[PDB]
Amino acid sequence: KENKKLLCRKCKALACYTADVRVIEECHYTVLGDAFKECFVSRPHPKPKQFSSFEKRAKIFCARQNCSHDWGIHVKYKTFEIPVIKIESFVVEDIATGVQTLYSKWKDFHFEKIPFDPAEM
Ligand SMILES: [Hg+2]
């Protein structure tokens, strides 16, 4: 459908746009661009996990002050250090109406799901 906004469920700060989102292995959602990396911080994880297609290095949080809401993790996919987010950490907002939507799973969120391309970086 139309490009949409993802806002931090807790503070509502603008996180990214659906246009920036990319899909890895059909079920992992990452976000391209430098603007997005101005919104989250990374905190190393002492006892990560061993995901099937990537290495988990840390959890990421809303860079905002007094928020620090869990957004997902930061991983090494192939040769990239990228963020992978959980839709439940966001509110999806329609730009032209302001209608806000809360999802728990990416499967139920129907936007243009574009496969991750190493080309784009
Ligand atoms: Hg936030």
From Swiss-Prot:
Entry's family note: Belongs to the helicase family. RLR subfamily.
Implicated disorder: Singleton-Merten syndrome 2: A form of Singleton-Merten syndrome, an autosomal dominant disorder characterized by marked aortic calcification, dental anomalies, osteopenia, acro-osteolysis, and to a lesser extent glaucoma, psoriasis, muscle weakness, and joint laxity. Additional clinical manifestations include particular facial characteristics and abnormal joint and muscle ligaments. SGMRT2 is an atypical form characterized by variable expression of glaucoma, aortic calcification, and skeletal abnormalities, without dental anomalies.
Record note on domains: The RLR CTR domain controls homooligomerization and interaction with MAVS/IPS1. In the absence of viral infection, the protein is maintained as a monomer in an autoinhibited state with the CARD domains masked through intramolecular interactions with the RLR CTR domain. Upon binding to viral RNA and ubiquitination by RNF135, a conformational change releases the autoinhibition promoting further homooligomerization, interaction of the CARD domains with the adapter protein MAVS/IPS1 and activation of the downstream RIG-I signaling pathway. The helicase domain is responsible for dsRNA recognition.
Record's protein name: Antiviral innate immune response receptor RIG-I
Cross-link (Glycyl lysine isopeptide (Lys-Gly) (interchain with G-Cter in ubiquitin)) at residue(s): 10
Induction remark: By bacterial lipopolysaccharides (LPS) in endothelial cells. By interferon (IFN).
Gene of this entry: RIGI
Quaternary assembly: Monomer; maintained as a monomer in an autoinhibited state. Upon binding of viral RNAs and conformational shift, homooligomerizes and forms filaments on these molecules. Interacts (via tandem CARD domain) with MAVS/IPS1 promoting its filamentation. Interacts with DHX58/LGP2, IKBKE, TBK1 and STING1. Interacts (via CARD domain) with TRIM25 (via SPRY domain). Interacts (double-stranded RNA-bound oligomeric form) with RNF135 (homodimer); involved in RNA length-dependent activation of the RIG-I signaling pathway. Interacts with CYLD. (Microbial infection) Interacts with protein Z of Guanarito virus, Machupo virus, Junin arenavirus and Sabia virus. This interaction disrupts its interaction with MAVS/IPS1, impeding downstream IRF3 and NF-kappa-B activation and resulting in decreased IFN-beta induction.
Region listing for Mediates interaction with RNF135, in residue ranges: 1-121
